Design a protein around this ligand. Structure first.
Ligand code: MG
Ligand code: MG
Ligand code: MG
Ligand code: MG
Ligand code: MG
Ligand code: MG
Ligand code: MG
Ligand code: MG
Ligand code: MG
Ligand code: MG
Ligand code: MG
Ligand code: MG
Ligand code: MG
Ligand code: MG
Lengths: 144, 102, 203, 210
RNA sequence: GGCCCCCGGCGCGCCGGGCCCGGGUCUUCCCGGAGUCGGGUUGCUUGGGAAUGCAGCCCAAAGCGGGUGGUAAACUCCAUCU
RNA sequence: CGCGACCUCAGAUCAGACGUGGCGACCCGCUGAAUUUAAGCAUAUUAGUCAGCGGAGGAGAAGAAACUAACCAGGAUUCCCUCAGUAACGGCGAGUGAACAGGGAAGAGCCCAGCGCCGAAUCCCCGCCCCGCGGCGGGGCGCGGGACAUGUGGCGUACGGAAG
């Protein structure tokens, strides 16, 4: 008899919805090591001549990691939380559905921590969280 | 004189002016914070109650409070710890009573 | 702030969710060998609380020890002597089972350094512990201050000298009136001081 | 066997004492080694005091010794805070600190801040770069006035307030010292039971009329 | 006392690069280690004596909480540490 | 109905490292007697000692209070003097037996996890170039691999801390 706190992770998103969710999530992947180097060098070149600081509107990005996502949920800063269904030490995320529901942030459970890892250029990710999003994707995020 | 400092009596001791100050930060240990209370309430509704805690609630439901305290003290171990645990178990019973009232 | 929730979760070992997880895991560990390397800490919050960091050089070994007391290993229960020493059963080992599991991990992996250990489950016949080991010659460990201490020669086989947290608990160390047996560093240190006759030059 | 009158003696030599006998033939050598280390340490910290940091004024705990005052482990943070010294700078300029010591009274507090202010006035501070004196001291008061200090810094000394002879007043003559001590002991002994008896009598009083 | 040879750590000017703001006041926030403590029992240990410490088994925490305050226990105040 | 990702495992005379065994006076963790004394002897004593097993270093262990106290309070550890053959334990017999305060030797303090903030800021490996060799480091480069969000680094730890 599996307790509901552990059984809830068997209810994952359907293949159709998980496809729209990951297709949207592909637009907000964290920048890789290579394109961070390219961005940082461009800032050094631009700072040298001649704009200066130039924050240039740090773009929205997908926040990843159970500790990062938990704080965002506790601060009501996350707009959407995606939880992998197969976290092998299943204590890292058992509180997250209840915590997300308590704080009012919508949450879904998706198939595969490996798919979340490819979103963040890593092997595995427990959870990813959607913070503020670009205007052209506000309609898409609302439907999800 | 009429009265002298004494080594004995209710007011015994050498007389010094007490230096009042803020207590040390280690004395703050054990205080419940707003965030830690929130976390513990989260885990409680995720987890539930231990089987002995549920049994003690059945005793408190039928108002066998002395028997409930005997049971809790036998489980937890000491009278002081049992009294605190019985108050909390009584509080959750009262909380779910008024929740079901509305 | 997820580590706070996992900590409070593991303090509820008799809940339905934790009872299920502990039973299933204890079954799985029962199917493996007595000494077995774990790919990752089962309790990442408890591991890092005890000194573990998710970097190269830290390894985890799951150890299974047999529960119960220490039967006196004499043939046919004959302890030839006075009746005060006739005891064979109901005898207890001075060191805890956690200290024994640490010793078994350290003896097998003699090239590593035992850091700490923690409880992951128990049966009626077995207790399961996960031991944190450190490779003292990995460059991640060796090039880092605040970790270079484990690389010193004096810190080899801490678990066999009672220097880990589990092994320290049986030595009777501490401050104050409850721990007068070990003033001087150990029981033997206190006993030698209290049983040595100081014969000064001028008596 | 006992023989006539004598003291009943209990030697503790039943436990193979001859394996653990500490002779002291290295005592003169130990004193030489300790003296050499003291002299080497003094040379290493060349103008700094040989004994080490200044220690606070500290009263001895129990009722046997509370009339005496000695040197403590270090100055409390409350003392340093009101003396205006940073708790991390103090150890650099030769001030021992004790973060775990509290100040129950104000007299011991103020006694130790005058000790810190006196030490701070008597301190000669050398600049980090001798060619660049930033804020330490003038060269005049450190060219020749700098000298390694022998013995404890400002050694802690018991002081007695001498009272001049005075004419005994009649109130002092009529004071009953033995009677006051006997009554004070009785009052402390019966204080709890007197309150309970008054409490019980108050309970009977508030319902005596019905 | 002399001469010879080798090795090691002390200040100055320069060298190659790192090296990043400190204090006081006020305001707003944040604060802790769990099969662990503790309890029962058993065995050993201690000067520790209605049980000093250690361990096995069973129970099994809290957060104005917990531990200690050398006589077991209830209530109460205080002290001290964390 | 095969191809990928991850997880959990396996093999290799894979690349590079590490452990084993000796000594063991001193030190640390266990295990652990009986002779002996009690004019017998069983608890006790011998003794947490001999023997036995393991593990170190030039010292080790301990160590910065879940301390002592009850005072007008002291303030990590270790060692010496004293407390003291005392409080206490004990067929309360034989016997055993500390600690606090005090005076000295020495004196030194700190770090994480957690809570948080910072675009993982972090680390290992491999090739290339330069400065060096003497214990193999410094600097730069690689749309070079890997670790790592199941949490690296910086700030920060109960003496409070952070941000304005
Ligand atoms: Mg015997
Ligand atoms: Mg009492
Ligand atoms: Mg090879
Ligand atoms: Mg060896
Ligand atoms: Mg005999
Ligand atoms: Mg005889
Ligand atoms: Mg031996
Ligand atoms: Mg050491
Ligand atoms: Mg240590
Ligand atoms: Mg501390
Ligand atoms: Mg005497
Ligand atoms: Mg003895
Ligand atoms: Mg001295
Ligand atoms: Mg961190």
């Amino acid at each position: 008899k599996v307790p509901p706190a552990i059984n809830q992770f068997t209810q994952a998103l359907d293949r159709q919805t998980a496809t729209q969710l990951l297709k949207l999530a592909h637009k907000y992947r964290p920048e890789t090591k290579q394109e961070k180097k390219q961005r940082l060098l461009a800032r050094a070149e631009k700072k040298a001549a001649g704009k200066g600081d130039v924050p240039t509107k740090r773009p929205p990005v997908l926040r990843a990691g159970v500790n990062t996502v938990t704080t965002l949920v506790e601060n009501k800063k996350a707009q959407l939380v995606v939880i992998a269904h197969d976290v092998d030490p299943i204590e890292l995320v058992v509180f997250l559905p209840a915590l997300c529901r308590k704080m009012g942030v919508p949450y879904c459970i998706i198939k595969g921590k490996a798919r979340l890892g490819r979103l963040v250029h890593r092997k595995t990710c427990t959870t990813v969280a959607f913070t503020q999003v670009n205007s052209e994707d506000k309609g898409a995020l609302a439907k999800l | 004189a009429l009265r002298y400092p004494m080594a004995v009596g209710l007011n015994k001791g050498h007389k010094v002016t007490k230096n009042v100050s803020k207590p040390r930060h280690s004395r703050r240990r054990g205080r419940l914070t707003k965030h830690t209370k929130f976390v513990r309430d989260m885990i409680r509704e995720v987890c539930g109650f231990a089987p002995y805690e549920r049994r003690a609630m059945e005793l408190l439901k039928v108002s066998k409070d002395k028997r409930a305290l005997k049971f809790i003290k036998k489980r937890v171990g000491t009278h002081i710890r049992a009294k605190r645990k019985r108050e909390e178990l009584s509080n959750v019973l009262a909380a779910m009573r008024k929740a079901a009232a509305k | 702030g997820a580590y706070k929730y996992i900590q409070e979760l593991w303090r509820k070992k008799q809940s339905d969710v934790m009872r299920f997880l502990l039973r299933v895991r204890c079954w799985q560990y029962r199917q493996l060998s007595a000494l077995h390397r774990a790919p990752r800490p089962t309790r990442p919050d408890k591991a890092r609380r005890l000194g573990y960091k998710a970097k190269q050089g830290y390894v985890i070994y799951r150890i299974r020890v047999r529960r119960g007391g220490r039967k006196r290993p004499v043939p046919k229960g004959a302890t030839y002597g006075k009746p005060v020493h006739h005891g064979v059963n109901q005898l207890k080992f001075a060191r805890s089972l956690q200290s024994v599991a640490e010793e078994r991990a350290g003896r097998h992996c003699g090239a590593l350094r035992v850091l700490n250990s923690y409880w992951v489950g128990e049966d009626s016949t077995y207790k399961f512990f996960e031991v944190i080991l450190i490779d003292p010659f990995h460059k991640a460990i060796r090039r880092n201050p605040d970790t270079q201490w484990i690389t010193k020669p004096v810190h080899k086989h801490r678990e066999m000298r009672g220097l880990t947290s589990a092994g320290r608990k049986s030595r009777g160390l501490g401050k104050g009136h409850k721990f007068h047996h070990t003033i001087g560093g150990s029981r033997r240190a206190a006993w030698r001081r209290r049983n040595t006759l100081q014969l000064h030059r001028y008596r | 066997a006992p023989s006539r009158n004598g003291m009943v003696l209990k030697p503790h030599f039943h436990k193979d004492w001859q394996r653990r006998v500490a002779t002291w033939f290295n005592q003169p050598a130990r004193k030489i080694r300790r003296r050499k280390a003291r002299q080497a340490k003094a040379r290493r910290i060349a103008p700094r005091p040989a004994s080490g940091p200044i220690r606070p004024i500290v009263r001895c705990p129990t009722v046997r010794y509370h009339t005496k005052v000695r040197a403590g482990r270090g100055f409390s943070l409350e003392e340093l805070r009101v003396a205006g010294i940073h708790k991390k700078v103090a150890r650099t300029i030769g001030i021992s600190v004790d973060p775990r010591r509290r100040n129950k009274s104000t007299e011991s507090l103020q006694a130790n801040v005058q000790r810190l202010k006196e030490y701070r006035s008597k301190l000669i501070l050398f600049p980090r770069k001798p060619s660049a004196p930033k804020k330490g001291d003038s060269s005049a008061e450190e060219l020749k006035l700098a000298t390694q200090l022998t013995g404890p810094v400002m050694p802690v000394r018991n002081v007695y307030k001498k009272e001049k002879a005075r004419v005994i007043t009649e109130e002092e003559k009529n004071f009953k010292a033995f009677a006051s001590l006997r009554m004070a002991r009785a009052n402390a002994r019966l204080f709890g039971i007197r309150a309970k008896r008054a409490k019980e009598a108050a309970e009977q009083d508030v319902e005596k009329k019905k």
